[PDB]
Structures are given as C-alpha cells and as structure tokens.
Design a protein around this nucleic acid. Structure first.
Ligand code: ZN
Ligand code: ZN
Ligand code: ZN
Ligand code: ZN
Lengths: 73, 72
DNA sequence: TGCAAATGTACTAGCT
DNA sequence: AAGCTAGTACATTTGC
C-alpha cells in the first residue's frame, strides 16, 4: 500500500539520491556525507534500522543508506 | 579517580545507590519515572562507554539495573 | 535554567 | 496546469 523507505521502513516520500526513502533519511544522508560526525556503533556494525531504532545507530544508518545505493549525484 | 559503574565516565557521586556519572544519574531518573519502553538495535549487549551510551537506552537501562540503581 | 548539536518536518526552488 | 526531487528553514529532540 504505502511506499516504504528502503533504509528505515518509515513512509517513503520520494526517490531521494537514487533510493526510495523517507524525509528523515534523505536529510540524514546528506548531512552524513557533507558533515563531520563521530558516529560509532555500539554493537557489531550490523544494527537493525527501523523507524525507532534508526536514531540508535547513525553509523549503521549511514552504512545501510550506502548499501541501498544512495549517492549525491 | 571515580568511574561510573554504568558507562565508565567520570562518576560524580553515588546516585540511586550506585557510583555514576551525572549523565547516568539523570538518564536513570528519567527511565525509571516514565516509560522505558526502549529498543535495542543490536543483540542486547551494546557497549555502553562515554561515547556510545547515547546509542542504546535499552542496554543502558539494563546496565543501570544490573549495577543496582533504585529509588532508595 | 542556558547553549548547542542531532534529528525530523514542512516548505520552497526549479525542472519537465 | 501536474508531477517530481533537491534544497532549506523551522521545529523538535536530545545532551552537556
Ligand atoms: Zn527512512
Ligand atoms: Zn550499529
Ligand atoms: Zn555513566
Ligand atoms: Zn543495545
């Protein structure tokens, strides 16, 4: 029914940077590329990213964005 | 020379029965008072150090309880 | 309390 | 019109 972001499963708003994603992942990805962050995972570089757990691990969120194909060109 | 028994930061005193940093003092008070329906994105054994304690409320609250924090 | 960083929404710019 | 996304400003969250 409702389009699903391929990063967090929140409702997708469009195809952003090459990948159907939600509003919060679009801006999260651009800020992650062009910004400095000490994103450090606390598990095994392998976390679950869903609508809640996405805030838990930005390191694994960024990782799953890239594995989904996001790119700024 | 005083380490937090939850995250290992500069403990600021004995809070809710446990030597703990300021940040863990406040986090446990918030967690214990309201819902703590937190969720872990890993395997319920996330590393909870000064850097990564922000990452997993669920594992942090679990560690608070393991260390003995309570409202005595 | 304050200050600030991170995150998320809603909106505008600009294209076709 | 219609439909799209990238950007941006604002608000909210979260944390010292
Ligand atoms: Zn998303
Ligand atoms: Zn992770
Ligand atoms: Zn602590
Ligand atoms: Zn965890």
């Amino acid at each position: 029914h409702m389009k699903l972001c391929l990063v967090c499963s929140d409702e997708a708003s469009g195809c952003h940077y090459g990948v159907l994603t939600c509003g919060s992942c679009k801006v999260f990805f651009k800020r992650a590329v062009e910004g400095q962050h000490n994103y450090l995972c606390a598990g095994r570089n392998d976390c679950i990213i869903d609508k809640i757990r996405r805030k838990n691990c930005p390191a694994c969120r960024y990782r799953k964005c890239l594995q989904a194909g996001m790119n700024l060109e």
